Amino acid sequence: RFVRTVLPFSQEFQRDKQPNAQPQYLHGSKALNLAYSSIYGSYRNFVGPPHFQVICRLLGYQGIAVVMEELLKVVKSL
């Protein structure tokens, strides 16, 4: 399993701003949204086999190929 570092050495990610929308466009309602957020809140602080399998399913083969190529480039640069 992967767990975050005790002191971060990188915070320049500067992610985008979360877009707000009605509950219907979300899981469906405030209660449903809260329930799903609570359900999925256990995976926030770690990365494991579930995340890897979801990534594989979502990236098929093209995503894995391109990600590994970029990782090889990064390793070569470093």
Binding site: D16, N20, A21, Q22
Partner: peptide
Amino acid sequence: KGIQLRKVEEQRENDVATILSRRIAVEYS
């Protein structure tokens, strides 16, 4: 470049549907 384009190239009346969509979106934030 894609994220920069998406940020800058954002979105840009006498249609009832548009007016209603405005009221409900305003009742939200």
